[PDB]
């Protein structure tokens, strides 16, 4: 007898109402897997009689230990997330509301919830899997029209290299920004406000540009802003048509209790 897998899903909602009230012959578990993308919010609706261990009592993924942590709140790993656990009577029947509010800046997370009906026989189970994670890892130099500068933002957004508790594997912690090198134009590399960003990533980007002599560059300032440690570099007139890519590794930077950074990979295109 194999553990049977069922799957339900709605529009940005996980409805387990009147779906967990029967008894199969073998062990079964109905799954509701969701992946929020464009700041969407999720609702989890199930019958009140069911025992629900969600939100504050969920199983969250810990990238530091590469496993899951039992009986923990998800706000302890994605603080910008905020929810509400209320009691509503949906479709006449008394239901349980598990409404989560996902901001745009909310850090990536990966947790599951157990919806178990109280019975002496535990053959039926319900599970909701939440996978908040960035899916765009390859963008270009965002030319700011106001300041006439190119920006490769790794301090936030999709290319965020900030230590996050998101479910990313070893060969998935690769974000990259591509800056088509325009001569004599300012280029910004916004990085998270971290202690080691200036201590190791700044020497890392310096050594990448000095080895190639034909690359005409000039570091102007390292400006600390509100949240971004912007590296201000202007590339001068280049001679040979070349191509360069530099790696600013923060994937190994550990952050308690589970957060891990990303490896920045800026690709420079020298074309006339």
């Amino acid at each position: 007898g194999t553990q049977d897998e069922k799957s339900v899903k709605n529009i940005c909602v996980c409805d387990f109402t009147d779906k967990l009230n029967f008894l199969p012959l073998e062990k079964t578990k109905i799954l509701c897997e969701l992946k929020p993308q464009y700041g969407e919010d999720i609702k989890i609706i199930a019958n009140k009689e069911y025992e629900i261990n969600c939100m504050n009592n969920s199983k969250v993924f810990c990238p530091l230990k590469d496993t899951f942590i039992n009986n923990t709140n998800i706000k302890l790993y994605s603080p910008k997330l905020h929810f509400e656990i209320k009691d509503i009577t949906h479709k006449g029947k008394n239901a349980a509301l598990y409404y989560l509010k996902i901001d745009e800046e909310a850090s990536d997370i990966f947790f599951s919830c157990s919806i178990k009906p109280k019975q002496v026989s535990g053959l039926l189970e319900g599970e909701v899997r939440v996978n908040l994670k960035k899916h765009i890892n390859e963008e270009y130099s965002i030319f700011n029209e106001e300041e006439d500068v190119h920006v490769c933002d790794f301090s936030k957004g999709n290319l965020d290299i900030t230590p996050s508790a998101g479910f990313y594997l070893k060969n998935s912690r690769n974000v990259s920004c591509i800056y088509r090198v325009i001569p004599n134009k300012l280029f910004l590399i916004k990085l998270p406000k971290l202690d080691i960003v200036t201590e190791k990533l700044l020497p890392s980007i310096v050594n990448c540009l000095s080895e190639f002599s034909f690359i005409n560059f000039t570091l102007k300032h390292v400006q600390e802003g509100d949240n971004y440690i912007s590296f201000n570099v202007i590339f001068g007139e280049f001679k040979k048509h070349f191509n360069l890519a530099c790696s600013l590794d923060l994937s190994d930077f550990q952050q308690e209790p589970c957060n891990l950074g990303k490896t920045a990979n800026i690709t420079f295109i020298f074309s006339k």
Partner: nanobody
Amino acid sequence: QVQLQESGGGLVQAGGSLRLSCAASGRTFSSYAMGWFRQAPGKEREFVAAISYSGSNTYDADSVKGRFAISRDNAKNTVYLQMNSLKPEDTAVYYCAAAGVYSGTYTDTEFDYWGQGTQVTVSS
């Protein structure tokens, strides 16, 4: 959604070695955690070994501590089980299992998708 298939099983002598393999299909392999189980004919299904998502954390049982080592290859979409110094009571069908959520449990509860299982018999 993921399916599994075991291979490399058969017959072996005591103290030998077997390279058990389990390939997968469907959903991304590197996003699920793998683990081997076995069921001796008559006895129940017991835990053997387990490998994490990236492959850093290995979880083993007492009966096969040191002797059996589990390894995974995310690139090949395949998990392996290197069996060394097979005692004669290892005669069992060895099952391959995948778990979407995995908290290091030593039971079959977290594993959702299962394989078929190959026969491993050791004489002495």
